[PDB]
């Protein structure tokens, strides 16, 4: 499909990216800084090393409302970018309740923790028109 997260890396800093409708989903303006407890984050950081190598480092968070299947899912794909970063990246999943001084550090703006997401916008596409049968 479209993986943005496995094939980020166009600019040196930070980029947030979450996991929706099966594949990556970008967090627009207005929604990024809100962590949802329903869902898992991937953030990739990327910076220029003197050698200029481009550093990437990615920290995989979940949710506490995510079961390992959720939370599975996305570590699957954090895996994945590790194979193909098993160089000397930083990988670290961080949960719900336990998250480390690295996070607090990265937004000290204070992060809102939005929980149930009452909303029913979402529809399944279709297969064109039920014309075959």
């Given at each position: 499909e479209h993986p943005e997260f496995l094939?980020?890396?166009?600019?040196?800093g930070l980029q947030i990216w979450r996991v929706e409708k099966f594949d990556l989903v970008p967090v627009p303006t207005n929604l990024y800084g809100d962590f949802f407890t329903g869902d898992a984050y991937v953030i990739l950081k990327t910076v220029q090393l003197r050698n200029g190598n481009l550093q990437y480092d990615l920290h995989y968070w979940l949710g506490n409302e995510c079961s390992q299947d959720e939370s599975g899912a996305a570590a699957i794909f954090t895996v994945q970018l590790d194979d193909y970063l098993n160089g000397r990246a930083v990988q670290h999943r961080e949960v719900q309740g336990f998250e480390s001084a690295t996070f607090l550090g990265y937004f000290k703006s204070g992060l809102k923790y939005k929980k149930?997401?009452?909303?029913?916008?979402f529809k399944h596409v279709v297969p064109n028109e039920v014309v075959v049968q």
């Open positions: 094939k980020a890396g166009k600019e040196p149930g997401g009452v909303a029913s916008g």
